[PDB]
Design an enzyme around this catalytic site. Structure first.
Site, short mmCIF file in Angstrom:
data_model
loop_
_atom_site.label_atom_id
_atom_site.label_comp_id
_atom_site.label_asym_id
_atom_site.label_seq_id
_atom_site.Cartn_x
_atom_site.Cartn_y
_atom_site.Cartn_z
N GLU A 74 21.19 20.47 16.89
CA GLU A 74 21.39 21.36 18.03
C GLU A 74 20.67 22.71 17.86
O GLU A 74 20.14 23.25 18.83
CB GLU A 74 22.87 21.57 18.28
N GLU A 122 28.28 13.04 15.96
CA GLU A 122 29.62 13.55 16.31
C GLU A 122 30.59 12.44 16.75
O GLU A 122 31.77 12.48 16.39
CB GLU A 122 29.50 14.62 17.41
#
Lengths: 252, 252, 252
Positions: free
Chosen positions: A106, A126
């Site tokens: 990210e 995730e």
């Protein structure tokens, strides 16, 4: 010794996450350090481009889960994970070695350009922990690589090897292992050699046009164009080119 | 001798920029000539597809900076650089040899399809002169190739070789050097063989859907679909297929 | 014998179009069968992922033109061709052998992921019959592969070979001929092993973010994030990881 190191080389700001023992995981200190570095980049007229890298040969393992579990202010209101919800105005290059995972991917996605070692890897795992990549991974990955591959990576949590990432257009430059930062400096120097107002305006138009309609995009663009075309640098650029020599930019 | 040449071959309009000594740079004459050609394409029921190419083996070096400097009306209100702010309704193919740079790349981006010689190159080097690619380059390139590569090209001003451009999806067809126009005619003929109302409607839906929301896209699409499905050509297409022979389109 | 077959294997729903003599063309029965299967997928807490495939080694030749011509209710209001206007909430993988053409390519595009045999092919040849690919082909293909290639395929009606489709990012996994379903099951199993709430939320954010503005995307995302982060599965995921063992998801 700071957990985020910052070095200025001419007009390039080199930002190094400095927690190699923690795989450069983002804790409160790193989050704040990254935000401060981006503030420095955008606020200093003597800086044109920044490079973000992880010290020691691994980019960023993501958010520090321990720091997070025990109440560190890692995801900062208005900024996100360092700068994921507040990307800089000036160009940012991520120089990736080793793993850029979860929050690490990210961070890379919040940059404009990615230089990655041929043996590096990305990923947003995730969902494997029953969580979701909420730091911009899901919002940006499908815009950087083909939609279905972004979907696949998001639903499986699989690693994305750098060479595949280059095929898919996520990685701009593939570097020999250990040389991503040098390749990134070469890229940064190419950009710092160009007109600073024009470079920033160019990034602004590409980023902001995402939220423009086809019917309004040219008029919205024009507002950004005019200050560039009437700048001192626009004159200098024309003069320098006509005289076949390097332009001396002033950022005005 | 016109600075834009136009030739009709059956239902294909071949448009040739004819300023080889000026690297087919766009001046007022070329800008107007291009606009007139697009008007001709869209206005003539006997035309289905156009091909844009640069005479002499080089596509377009961009806007004519000299013509611009001395006050030629090159960027025309409502149309842009020839047609960059007013793309045609009917399909347009760019047949690229040599360099398509700056405004030249922007002309190619305003087309729907690109056929390029293997030794040709693209680029938007505007930032090198402290300017910005405002003719649609920044608005369209990130939509044609991966976002980060478009960013890289825009910030560096680097050339994009045709073979890389094909890898990235910007170039539809790679041609042997000197044969881009013939490859483009083959492509055009494939499109002119298909139902003219259906072809135009198909382009319309793909282009206009950029400004539709997911929740409205099917209803917006339907309005364009209905006149096609009730056309004479829809009947003829079904009859011809059932009889295993070529459909005789009427564009009604 | 049903024209759509459905088999549950653990948490995977395998959906097989069963009209091999008709090249698995979609008639009223298949359209309804597909819709029922998607309802089953989304409604059953014991299902996590579905796979759509065509029986007999060919995916889907598109809408059954004969069934259509004689008034079968094939394109169902609110659902489209089976589910093209109502994609499932849970992940859907298309396992493609042989031809996926016209409506068949549109079924694949309505899925999230595509596994395709190396000798399979896609295409939207509607314009050849003076028609338009209105089942989502024009709305989704330019979002899955580079814009200009989607344009080219739509205007020409050319076939897209699976290997090229993989290069372009439309196909996630290339499989040996005849083994696409097994490859798809492997992919499905990777996804079913991950947190079901997190997987569904991840798909939701990627799909819905298409209609969000840059200025609102993080706030819109947050609404979807919170129920995941406070779920029982979020706790279980953290516990399981810390104990280096498989998480026992509850979908709560």
């Amino acid at each position: 010794e700071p957990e985020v190191l910052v070095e200025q080389r001419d007009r390039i700001l080199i930002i190094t996450i400095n927690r190699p023992k923690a795989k450069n995981a983002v804790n409160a200190a790193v989050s704040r350090g990254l935000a401060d570095a981006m503030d420095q980049l955008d606020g200093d007229a003597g800086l044109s481009v920044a490079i973000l890298t992880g010290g020691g040969g691994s980019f960023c393992a993501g958010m520090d889960l321990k720091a997070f579990a025990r109440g560190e202010n890692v995801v900062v209101e208005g900024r996100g994970l360092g700068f994921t919800e507040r990307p800089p105005t000036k160009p940012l290059i991520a120089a990736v070695e080793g793993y850029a995972l979860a929050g690490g991917t990210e961070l890379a996605l919040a940059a404009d350009l990615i230089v990655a070692a041929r043996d590096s890897a990305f990923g947003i795992p995730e969902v494997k922990r029953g969580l979701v990549a909420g730091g911009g991974g899901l919002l940006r990955l499908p815009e950087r690589i083909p939609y279905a591959i972004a979907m696949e990576l998001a639903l499986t949590g699989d690693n994305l090897p750098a060479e595949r990432a280059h095929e898919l257009g996520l990685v701009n430059v593939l570097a020999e292992p250990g040389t991503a930062l040098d390749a990134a400096i070469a890229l940064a120097e190419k950009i710092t050699a160009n007109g600073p107002l024009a470079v920033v305006a160019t990034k602004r138009i590409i980023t902001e046009s995402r939220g423009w309609s086809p019917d309004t995009m040219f008029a919205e663009q024009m507002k950004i164009l005019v200050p560039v075309f009437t700048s001192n640098d626009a004159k200098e650029g024309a003069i320098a080119f006509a005289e076949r020599r390097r332009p001396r930019w002033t950022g005005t």
